[PDB]
Ligand binder design. Structure first.
Ligand SMILES: CC(C)C[C@H](N)P(=O)(O)C[C@H](CCC(=O)O)C(=O)O
Ligand SMILES: [Zn+2]
Ligand SMILES: [Zn+2]
Length: 393
């Protein structure tokens, strides 16, 4: 059979656990959670990267649904609860296809019965409003990882896409990591500064993840992971879940985006300005310099290098579907994963290598978080510390 046919067979046995899909945010923004208007039991290819049929075609067997909310708007906690509610409603609406999963055992139970294990991951520490009790509430509602920052610093952690702030994790930041370890919530180091990565690895007693990051050595962008951090994963036990975002994985796309941003500033606009006037400027740039397009090969280049440095036991996949408007050719929506698996087969990846990449590593890592949590919950009570106590007024 072809490598694509083989890929599909492999995925039927050991499907993809995807680390980060922003369907809930997409539903919030497109239709304010009017789920009938974007029914994922129907074909949503006109509007979304994700629906149930494409998840099945893509060989997705578990999904961490992102409950991302903006850090630059008030009411992050309320919005996070709305995102969690959206995930809950999706699970309730589609019991034939989705099964809530809170544990590694739940993931295996879902796989045994042919339903997509549906987990939740919060994207940014602003979702807890500097409150450890709020962190515990999110865990109680089903959140199983939290990215420590999004694109901006918060009071206790530095983001890769912001200026240096506290220098990594503050004292309170370390306390958040300790509490995540005690609860069994995975520490997610996507988005954070390299300093923050190192501080989190120093502090964490549980395996950490990167829910959607690729390799900085392969493509130098702050959203990607440095080799020295990848090297620490085998000791930590965690895993890096490669992402598909073109401007992170393809050199030409990083360079293009930098030039686009420079061009915006040359016209007196902030690079993130979305006014009609700014859009006209950007359109003119893209007119004279077409947007480069990444491929499956681009993503495989990251996995090859990440495998070499981090090890096959420390890799996963986090596509960022519905979180980015642009995708590599061959990975245009959630149905694309078999194309990546086929490319890896062609590059000599073994069947057991690929079962680790898709399924086994993610289940091991969540089980490890549970194991560490059992020990810590037995050893001490929850923390009552405040950010003022630990970081000062
Ligand atoms: C606003 C909302 C859709 C942002 C997403 N939650 P994201 O953080 O998942 C996508 C981003 C790449 C795409 C971009 O730069 O926006 C990244 O991961 O760095
Ligand atoms: Zn992100
Ligand atoms: Zn996201």
């Amino acid at each position: 059979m072809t490598s694509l046919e083989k890929a599909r067979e492999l995925l039927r046995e050991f499907p993809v656990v995807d680390g980060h899909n922003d369907l809930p945010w997409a539903l919030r923004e497109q239709v304010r959670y009017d789920l009938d208007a974007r029914d994922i039991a129907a074909d949503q290819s006109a509007h979304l990267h994700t629906d149930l049929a494409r998840l099945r075609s893509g060989g997705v067997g578990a999904q961490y649904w992102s409950v991302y909310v903006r850090s630059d708007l008030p009411g992050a906690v309320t919005a996070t609860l709305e995102q969690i509610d959206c995930v809950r409603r999706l699970i309730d609406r589609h019991p034939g296809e989705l099964r809530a999963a809170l544990t590694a055992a739940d993931m295996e139970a879902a796989r045994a019965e042919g339903r997509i294990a549906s987990l939740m991951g919060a994207e940014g520490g602003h979702s807890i409003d500097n409150s450890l009790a709020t962190l515990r509430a999110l865990y109680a509602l089903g959140v199983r990882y939290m990215t420590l920052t999004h694109n901006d610093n918060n009071a206790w952690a530095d983001s890769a896409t912001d200026e240096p702030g506290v220098g990594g994790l503050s004292a309170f930041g370390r306390e958040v990591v300790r509490e995540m370890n005690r609860e069994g919530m995975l520490v997610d180091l996507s988005h954070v500064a390299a300093t923050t990565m190192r501080d989190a690895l120093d502090t964490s007693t549980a395996p950490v993840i990167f829910s959607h990051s690729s390799s900085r050595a392969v493509c130098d962008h702050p959203r990607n992971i440095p080799d020295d951090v990848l090297e620490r994963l085998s000791a930590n036990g965690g895993m890096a879940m490669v992402t598909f975002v073109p401007k992170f994985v393809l050199q030409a796309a990083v360079d293009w985006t930098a030039e686009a941003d420079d061009n915006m500033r040359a016209h007196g606009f902030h690079h993130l300005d979305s006014s009609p006037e700014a859009m006209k400027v950007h359109a003119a740039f893209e007119e004279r310099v077409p947007r480069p397009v990444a491929t499956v090969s681009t993503v495989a280049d990251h996995l090859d290098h990440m495998r070499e440095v981090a090890g096959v036991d420390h890799l996963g996949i986090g596509g960022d579907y519905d979180g980015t408007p642009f995708t590599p050719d061959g990975l245009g929506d959630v149905s694309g994963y078999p194309n990546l698996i086929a490319e890896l087969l062609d590059r000599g990846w073994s069947q057991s290598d690929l079962a680790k990449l898709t399924w086994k590593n993610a289940v091991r890592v969540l089980d490890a978080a549970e194991d560490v949590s059992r020990g810590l919950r037995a050893a001490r009570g929850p923390s009552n510390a405040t950010i003022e106590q630990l970081d000062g007024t």
